[PDB]
UniProtKB/Swiss-Prot annotation, chain B:
Cross-link Glycyl lysine isopeptide (Lys-Gly) (interchain with G-Cter in ubiquitin), where in sequence: 176
Protein name (record): 26S proteasome non-ATPase regulatory subunit 7
UniProt GO MF annotations: protein homodimerization activity
Residues with the N6-acetyllysine modification: 200, 210
Gene of this entry: PSMD7
Free-text function comment from the UniProt entry: Component of the 26S proteasome, a multiprotein complex involved in the ATP-dependent degradation of ubiquitinated proteins. This complex plays a key role in the maintenance of protein homeostasis by removing misfolded or damaged proteins, which could impair cellular functions, and by removing proteins whose functions are no longer required. Therefore, the proteasome participates in numerous cellular processes, including cell cycle progression, apoptosis, or DNA damage repair.
Curated annotation (Swiss-Prot), chain C:
Residue list for modification N6-acetyllysine: 64
Gene: PSMD12
Name of protein: 26S proteasome non-ATPase regulatory subunit 12
Disease: Stankiewicz-Isidor syndrome: A neurodevelopmental disorder characterized by delayed psychomotor development, intellectual disability, behavioral disorders, mild dysmorphism, ophthalmologic anomalies, feeding difficulties, deafness, and variable congenital malformations of the cardiac and/or urogenital systems.
Residue span, PCI domain: 1-116
Highest taxon of source: Eukaryota
UniProt record similarity statement: Belongs to the proteasome subunit p55 family.
Subunit description: Component of the 19S proteasome regulatory particle complex. The 26S proteasome consists of a 20S core particle (CP) and two 19S regulatory subunits (RP). The regulatory particle is made of a lid composed of 9 subunits including PSMD12, a base containing 6 ATPases and few additional components. Interacts with ERCC6.
Function: Component of the 26S proteasome, a multiprotein complex involved in the ATP-dependent degradation of ubiquitinated proteins. This complex plays a key role in the maintenance of protein homeostasis by removing misfolded or damaged proteins, which could impair cellular functions, and by removing proteins whose functions are no longer required. Therefore, the proteasome participates in numerous cellular processes, including cell cycle progression, apoptosis, or DNA damage repair.
From Swiss-Prot, chain D:
Gene source species: Homo sapiens
Residues of the full protein shown: 371 to 422 of 422
Places the protein is found: Nucleus; Cytoplasm, Cytosol
Stimuli inducing this protein: By FOXO4; expression in embryonic stem cells (ESCs) is mediated by FOXO4.
Assembly, per entry: Component of the 19S proteasome regulatory particle complex. The 26S proteasome consists of a 20S core particle (CP) and two 19S regulatory subunits (RP). The regulatory particle is made of a lid composed of 9 subunits including PSMD11, a base containing 6 ATPases and few additional components.
PTM comment, free text: Phosphorylated by AMPK.
Family membership: Belongs to the proteasome subunit S9 family.
UniProt note on tissues of expression: Highly expressed in embryonic stem cells (ESCs). Expression decreases as ESCs differentiate.
Protein's name in the database: 26S proteasome non-ATPase regulatory subunit 11
Biological function: Component of the 26S proteasome, a multiprotein complex involved in the ATP-dependent degradation of ubiquitinated proteins. This complex plays a key role in the maintenance of protein homeostasis by removing misfolded or damaged proteins, which could impair cellular functions, and by removing proteins whose functions are no longer required. Therefore, the proteasome participates in numerous cellular processes, including cell cycle progression, apoptosis, or DNA damage repair. In the complex, PSMD11 is required for proteasome assembly.
Highest taxon in the source lineage: Eukaryota
Swiss-Prot record, chain E:
Quaternary structure (record): Component of the 19S proteasome regulatory particle complex. The 26S proteasome consists of a 20S core particle (CP) and two 19S regulatory subunits (RP). The regulatory particle is made of a lid composed of 9 subunits including PSMD13, a base containing 6 ATPases and few additional components.
Cysteine disulfide links: none
Annotated function: Component of the 26S proteasome, a multiprotein complex involved in the ATP-dependent degradation of ubiquitinated proteins. This complex plays a key role in the maintenance of protein homeostasis by removing misfolded or damaged proteins, which could impair cellular functions, and by removing proteins whose functions are no longer required. Therefore, the proteasome participates in numerous cellular processes, including cell cycle progression, apoptosis, or DNA damage repair.
Protein name: 26S proteasome non-ATPase regulatory subunit 13
Organism: Homo sapiens (Human)
Family: Belongs to the proteasome subunit S11 family.
Coiled-coil annotated residue ranges, if any: none
Coverage span on the entire protein: 283 to 376 of 376
Domain of life per record: Eukaryota
Amino acid sequence: QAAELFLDTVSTFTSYELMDYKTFVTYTVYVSMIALERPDLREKVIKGAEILEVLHSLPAVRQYLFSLYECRYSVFFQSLAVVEQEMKKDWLFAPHYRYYVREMRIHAYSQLLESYRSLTLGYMAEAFGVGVEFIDQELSRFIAAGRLHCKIDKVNEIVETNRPDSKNWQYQETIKKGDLLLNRVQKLSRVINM
Amino acid sequence: AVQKVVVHPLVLLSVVDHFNRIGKVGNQKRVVGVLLGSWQKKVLDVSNSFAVPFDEDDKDDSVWFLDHDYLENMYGMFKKVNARERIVGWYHTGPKLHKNDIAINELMKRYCPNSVLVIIDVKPKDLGLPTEAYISVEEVHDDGTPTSKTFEHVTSEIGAEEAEEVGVEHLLRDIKDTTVGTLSQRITNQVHGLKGLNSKLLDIRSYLEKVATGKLPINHQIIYQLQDVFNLLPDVSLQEFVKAFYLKTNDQMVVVYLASLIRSVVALHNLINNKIANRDAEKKEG
Amino acid sequence: LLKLFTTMELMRWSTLVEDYGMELRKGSLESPATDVFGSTEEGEKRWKDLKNRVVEHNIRIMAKYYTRITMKRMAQLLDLSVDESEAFLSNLVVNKTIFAKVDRLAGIINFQRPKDPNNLLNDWSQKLNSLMSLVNKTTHLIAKEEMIHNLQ
Amino acid sequence: DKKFHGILDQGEGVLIIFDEPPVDKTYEAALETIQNMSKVVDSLYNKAKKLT
Amino acid sequence: TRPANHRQLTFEEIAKSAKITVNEVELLVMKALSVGLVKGSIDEVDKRVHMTWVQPRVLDLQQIKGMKDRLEFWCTDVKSMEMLVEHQAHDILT
Amino acid sequence: GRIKAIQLEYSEARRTMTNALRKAPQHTAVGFKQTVHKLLIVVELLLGEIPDRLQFRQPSLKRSLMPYFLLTQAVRTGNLAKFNQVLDQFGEKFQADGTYTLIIRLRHNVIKTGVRMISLSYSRISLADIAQKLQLDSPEDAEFIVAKAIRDGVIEASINHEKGYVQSKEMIDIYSTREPQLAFHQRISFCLDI
Amino acid sequence: VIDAFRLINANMMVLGHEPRQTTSNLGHLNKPSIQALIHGLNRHYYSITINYRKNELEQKMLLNLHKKSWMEGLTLQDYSEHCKHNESVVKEMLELAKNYNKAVEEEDKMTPEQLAIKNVGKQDPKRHLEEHVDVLMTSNIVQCLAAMLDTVVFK
């Protein structure tokens, strides 16, 4: 919601009372990538005239946004670490500072794995930040979590992608969403009539 | 020819009245008359019928009488009362399509060049519709006989006019599939359809009794259709068809799920709406 | 001309030319033949165009009667090199005339639209309707025969 | 960029192409309806919990 | 001859029974389909020919008895599925 | 609920308690809410389903469930050492609440969950590597539990005894199967019940 | 609506003696219509009770014939179009449900009769939502059931 609302008010920022414009763009760029998909960025924050001009005064944030699009993943993490430490200190973001770093990492992994089919994690260990065991350790946790569609073969050190149809997730959540509502309706029934 | 023939309730009733009016003999005899009606966009409608005298001895079924003058004289009467209705065919109880009713059609072919005969039982105790409508179709072949001329069936259903429906439903006041929803469908098409399928299948089995005791020396054509029937049986449910079924049977369950959940919520709110009502009434009272 | 109607005419351009070389030089009157095909440039173009139509007929007809055809054998029927066969197939597919998806890594090209879940089931629905109607027609033919002559 | 629907196999340089059928709808409508009624039941709590 | 279940006539299995080479059976199947006498599809990857409808022919007096069997095994199956609905749907009836 | 809990009748143990939970008084009886909650989370953990995180944050459950929240940290993570290291820390309170008997039997679950995720995220993992990630302490016994885990249905794919790698089968396209209809029948039957 | 009639003699009214010499409480069962009473009802003509004769042969050959079908039971109703109908109906509940929320807060206010009259110009989601749900459940229950019934009747 924030990305959609903020991006609409990027060109109209009369509320200088909180979060002066220089910080408003950073917030709009910090939440824009975690919110929208790649085709949306092309005409919302990259080609956007208002936002590109402000970044000229900010060297750190500008390299963070364009790193993801330019596929310079090595500089992405170094930029994602500084945003990591800055978000903790910054108010209104510390509560979900851990969520942002973890979610951005998944968004980066899926971006790289989408193109290829059988890339080797030895190749990921260099083009996505140093470490072969880190990518192995980091990837394993995310696959078990249910995101980052890919499946790892250790002996040959190769990760093969898969293409789960957009129904298993859709069905898996329509039951999980239904359960939450269903529990709520059950609790209402017991509230009435003792 | 004609895709379908719709039979109004009045004509259906005027045939039952005809049989009882003359059926004092009791044992058995057909009753034959002349049908009236009109058609549009190649779909016939039959509304009125009058009784034409007709007798025929049982033995040597090549003798029978139908009063042409009575047909012509009376039609002058019916034409005056209603000009729209014109002769369209003939009807006869004739539960078994007696043989001689292929030269009779030639007698009535004069008044209606393309006439249809509708067999409507007067004593029905069964499950199927009591109105079979046949039309005459010609083709000569070297198998059956040198003179070949046979009837071809046209689907028939019981129609309803605005005026007739008022009386028909008033006359019944006996049983109606009230609350026409999942209850009537599970009984008006599912169970009844299975009953009909079994009877038609049983009819095929009865004819196939000729395998042992020959009645007719293998009709040939009947076998041809039966072979095509078997090939058309749905392919065994073991291949990708099974996945397709589940991906669609379950897809229909989601909508049922959503509908039920919405039903519960509305039901729960309804109870709350009512329950707060009497609590408020009771609290003020005492 | 009858070779474009009946038998579905899997044509061999080699046989078509050898059986009909008269339409380029002479015949009974061959008057259109000299103008239509006998020229130098205008007629010659219509020679290539006829081969395209003859190749188009072979490709379309094989589509109706084929589920998957190996690329190599496709060239033999069409009478063009494998590379040329791909070029013509791509031209037809790109213009939305013939449905075909080619897996050139294995030289197999299949003419079957990936069956949809509803289409697979919808066809099953139509099979029942014909089966039910035939059963109704079968019984109604029995009464005309079994219940007519028997009584006699 | 969501222009193609395939992947690149670096093993033999082959561009596999996929169909990727649509989202099929009739699930987002169900999903949004579930959540829209999720707050409708929420509106029912305050009608009963704090009223009856 | 083949039961409707299998109907997977292979290329070799057709050439042998008609005295044709393997590289020629293709023109035979199309010829049969072109006239309209059999229906099916040709798969020249596993060398298989599917058949779905062979034109009906005459059955003297024994294949017709077998046809009776397939109706008895089918009428009894439809019979069972009738009472199943009628018994478990007694409330929803009349 | 507790009677069935101690006798391995877990399936009905969870359903019996949750029904007691919703029928239990809300405003008062706070004392026994903690006890009912404590056993349910332990019964769920043995079953395998992850307990909801909502009731580890309630004002009246924050302190009480801490000895049991840390337990669910080790059980959810496939590693076995964490569970052992969590037992020695809070074993006493398990004694004090008369529930330690049910916890010492969780060692099997800590492996079942880990083997499930490990087989879910990897496709061909060396047999030795399995022990290191699950802290099995040796590769010789890894085969049996991995072999045993296959019988019960914990994981699907087979193993190569000679080569020494555990392979996993690509289980995709779950929608076509009949299980989604079964899940919908359960919700449908009760929803039509209310 | 028939109400068969008959004429009364003018001599009787001149004589003044009431006709029909009622000898049973059978004719005074139907209240004469005020419209008919305005005219010469019980003044120039008297009504006669009208009833009907019905027999099972007539009824069974009319009631069990009017609205019937032969084989429509085992027809799967254009499986491709069936789910499309579901999508349109369900999508209507997405907006219909949202208006339900806005129709619960403003309710339960004073003068419910005022609330009752306030639903005379705008669609009420309470009834509209139920109507769609009713059709949705029956259409799929019938449509789904025919799927398994057919799968056993035919091979």
